Design a protein. Structure first.
Length: 89
């Protein structure tokens, strides 16, 4: 019994642990014109982990997981809306 390898909550905590960091690295970024590609790509990866804590026989899971999906997807989107734009204007 050695914590570190096992865990259903810790695996998720990370999905948000990095997400937060990224946001910052993006804000300070002067010319994120390129980050929009990396910053996003990385985000998508995180969510993937959530797949592990798939709908389990517990309320904390179904909730935590979901709440997390929207906590990470919110950024991935904010980027897409920023990337695209009107050619003229």
């Amino acid at each position: 019994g050695s914590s570190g390898s096992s865990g259903s909550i810790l695996k998720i905590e990370k999905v948000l642990k990095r997400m937060r960091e990224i946001k910052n690295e993006l804000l300070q970024a002067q010319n994120p014109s390129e980050l929009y590609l990396s910053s996003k790509t990385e985000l998508q990866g995180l969510i993937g982990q959530l797949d592990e804590v798939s709908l389990e026989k517990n309320p904390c899971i179904r909730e935590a997981r979901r709440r997390a999906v929207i906590e990470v997807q919110t950024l991935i989107t904010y980027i897409d809306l920023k990337e695209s734009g009107p050619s003229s204007g």
